[PDB]
Amino acid sequence: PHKFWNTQPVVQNDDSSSEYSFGPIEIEPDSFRKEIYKLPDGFSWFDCNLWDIESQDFEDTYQLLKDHYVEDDDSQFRFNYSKEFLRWALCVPGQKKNWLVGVRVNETKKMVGFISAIPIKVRIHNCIMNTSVVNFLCVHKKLRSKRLAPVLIKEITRRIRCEKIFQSIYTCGKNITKPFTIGTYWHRIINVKKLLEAGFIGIPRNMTMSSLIKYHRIPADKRIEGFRPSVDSDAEQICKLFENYFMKYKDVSNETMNNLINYDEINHSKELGKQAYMKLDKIEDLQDKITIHQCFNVEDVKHYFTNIDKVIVTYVRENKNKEITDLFSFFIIESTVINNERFPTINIAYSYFNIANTCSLKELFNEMLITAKNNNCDAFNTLDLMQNLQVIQDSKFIIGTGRLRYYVFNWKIPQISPSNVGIILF
Ligand SMILES: CCCCCCCCCCCCCC(=O)SCCNC(=O)CCNC(=O)[C@H](O)C(C)(C)COP(=O)(O)OP(=O)(O)OC[C@H]1O[C@@H](n2cnc3c(N)ncnc32)[C@H](O)[C@@H]1OP(=O)(O)O
Ligand SMILES: Cc1csc(NC(=O)c2cccc3[nH]c(-c4ccccc4N4CCNCC4)nc23)n1
Ligand SMILES: [Cl-]
Ligand SMILES: [Cl-]
């Protein structure tokens, strides 16, 4: 029984709609609460100054997440996002100062809560829109189970709506309301001895450390040439590469892709916003296609698909005309090994966006796995989004624990396969 989520414009688990459709759940451009939400006495909101990596706010945020953010099931690993990562992930083109929200104890100046939104452009079927991604919701462990989280969620909702944005995308490792897709975690072991020492895997009875090393080795043969790190001057080419990829896997006609309904222009009117509703005759119309994905202009490409040591790795393949034809990318997050004083962290790569045109996706990932090994990553993690199952199948990836639930706030999306989703959250 929910007490907060049952009041929100999201599809509920008990929803009994017998039709597949798309569109906003509600069009309420001026009826939302505009007054700041009250925090418990002694606590105050503040806009978190992540615009200078040396600021005190950035140290406070880094420390809060380091000790209190997402942990695995058994509380053996906790994410340890670096400050350079958080800057790359949160100070994105178009970001607003007030979408990085902290909660501080007034007497001690201790930061005890955080929630963030980043602006992104997304296509959802026949619509395109400026939207938000909510991430890094975090409450101090000593303040949990006191119903603070709905306060932080309502407050970021208010701050997003003040920017005339009424939808959001977010993920969760547990079921809340009805998710529009469910992602499966997959792990590729790179550094066996480190992951054994960390307790992530163990040594099977029918194996040895040496046979494990042998089994999990990244294949060294069949190397395809032409790959190099991306640079800023690649941005226009990379932008075109992404447009052609999303055009290839579209779930709407060519004319539709070229004339997407821009919800930003009609979300101010209950009558005009109705144009965004779209009934789907057959669910099979979407099979093998991408239905929802982020859209990147040249400025976004320059920011996201770059190379920052220990944060983000982007390589492109060139042909004999020196034209970019393929791309792989992954970001890098350390995790704390909670109960290991002498081996306190591991370095994990996470697949981001990958486009294979001149090679198979399996060959592309093999080149990416080698590069992640050479970037000192102990494992390579992926979701079964987009065409990744092609590589996950008949590979040495091992399934993870739990599932990643995808949600859209104030939009209707039929339950779809993760192959239909091109949205990666940090
Ligand atoms: C138009 C714009 C819209 C913008 C907003 C879009 C929505 C954004 C939504 C957020 C996007 C998250 C994206 C990410 O960052 S996902 C990762 C979230 N962060 C962590 O897991 C870090 C460690 N954990 C914690 O810090 C706390 O446990 C948190 C802060 C998560 C909850 O603290 P606490 O454990 O002290 O709980 P409570 O007593 O205060 O409150 C209980 C209520 O909160 C609901 N709850 C609990 N966890 C989540 C969750 N992860 N998403 C959504 N709802 C959640 C729960 O169902 C219940 O409601 P109801 O079941 O009674 O109804
Ligand atoms: C090799 C190794 C050692 S520890 C480790 N993962 C943890 O500890 C851990 C703990 C909690 C949640 C997790 N989700 C994932 C993950 C795994 C694969 C693909 C995406 C993933 N997520 C990352 C975060 N954003 C959304 C997508 N991993 C964890 N992997
Ligand atoms: Cl209030
Ligand atoms: Cl679920």
Q: 182 CB less than 6 Å from ligand 1?
A: no
Q: 153 CB less than 6 Å from ligand 1?
A: yes
Q: 425 CB less than 6 Å from ligand 1?
A: no
CA gap 143, 129 in Å, rounded: 36
Q: Which helix (H) or strand (E) holds 392?
A: helix 389-392
Q: Which residues of 286-308 are buried (b: 16+ CB within 10 A; e: fewer)?
A: beeebbbbbbbeeebbbbbbbee
Residue 87: both structure tokens together: 């800057």
| Positive or negative torsion for Cα 371, 183, 67, 169 | positive
Give the total residue count for the chain.
426
Contacts of 186 (CB under 8 A, 6+ apart): 381, 382, 383, 384, 388, 392, 397, 398, 399, 400
Burial of 108: CB neighbours in 10 Å, binned 0-12, 13-18, 19+: exposed
Report whether 190 contacts 379 (CB < 8 A).
yes
What protein residues have CB closer than 5 angstroms to ion ligand 3? 37-38
Contacts of 104 (CB under 8 A, 6+ apart): 43, 44, 45, 46, 110, 111, 112
CA of 121 to the centre of ligand 1 (A): 24
Annotated binding site: 2-5, 136-137, 139, 145, 147-149, 174
Residue 36: both structure tokens together: 């700041």
CA of 183 to the centre of ligand 4 (A): 10
Residue 363: both structure tokens together: 């060959």
Query: Nearest CA to 157 among 49, 7, 33, 50?
Result: 33
Q: How many CB atoms lie within 10 A of CB 53?
A: 14
Report whether 367 contacts 315 (CB < 8 A).
yes
Report whether 33 contacts 8 (CB < 8 A).
no
Q: How many CB atoms lie within 10 A of CB 45?
A: 19
Q: Which residues of 197-236 are buried (b: 16+ CB within 10 A; e: fewer)?
A: ebebeeeeeeeeeeebeeebebeeeeeeebbeebeeebbe
Q: Ligand 2: which residue has its CA nearest to atom 10?
A: 72
Q: 26 CB less than 6 Å from ligand 2?
A: no
Burial of 324: CB neighbours in 10 Å, binned 0-12, 13-18, 19+: buried
Q: Which residues of 407-421 are buried (b: 16+ CB within 10 A; e: fewer)?
A: bbbbbbbbebbbbbb
Contacts of 159 (CB under 8 A, 6+ apart): 96, 98, 99, 101, 117
3-state DSSP call for residue 61? helix
CA of 153 to the centre of ligand 1 (A): 7
Q: How many CB atoms lie within 10 A of CB 103?
A: 26
Dump the DSSP string for 101-143. Answer: EEEEETTT--EEEEEEEEEEEEEETTEEEEEEEEEEEEE-GGG
Query: Nearest CA to 61 among 131, 132, 120, 135?
Result: 135
Q: Looking at domain 5-182, what is its CATH homologous superfamily?
A: Gcn5-related N-acetyltransferase (GNAT) (3.40.630.30)
Annotated binding site for tetradecanoyl-CoA: 2-5, 136-137, 139, 145, 147-149, 174
CA gap 116, 425 in Å, rounded: 12
Report whether 421 contacts 181 (CB < 8 A).
yes
Long-range Cβ pairs for the range 49-52 (8 Å, 24+): 50/86, 50/87, 50/90, 50/91, 50/100, 51/91, 51/97
**Which residue type is seen at 89?**
A
Q: Ligand 2: which residue has its CA nearest to atom 1?
A: 379
Angle at 156 between CA 151 and CA 161, to 5 degrees: 125
Q: Could you say which ligand is closest to the alpha carbon of residue 388?
A: 2
Q: Half-sphere exposure of 70 toward its Cβ, with a 13 Å CA cutoff? A: 16
Q: 277 CB less than 6 Å from ligand 1?
A: no
Q: 381 CB less than 6 Å from ligand 2?
A: yes
CA of 211 to the centre of ligand 1 (A): 42
Report whether 317 contacts 334 (CB < 8 A).
no
Resolution (A): 2.0
CA gap 229, 234 in Å, rounded: 10
Residues in a beta bridge with 227: 317
Q: 7 CB less than 6 Å from ligand 1?
A: no
Dump the DSSP string for 29-55. Answer: SS-S--SPPPPPTTEEEEE---SSTTS
Q: Ligand 1: which residue has its CA nearest to atom 52?
A: 172
CA of 51 to the centre of ligand 4 (A): 36
Method: X-ray
Residues in a beta bridge with 381: 187, 350
Q: How many CB atoms lie within 10 A of CB 368?
A: 26
Query: In the block, which residue shows the tokens 């569109």?
Result: 23
CA gap 350, 333 in Å, rounded: 8
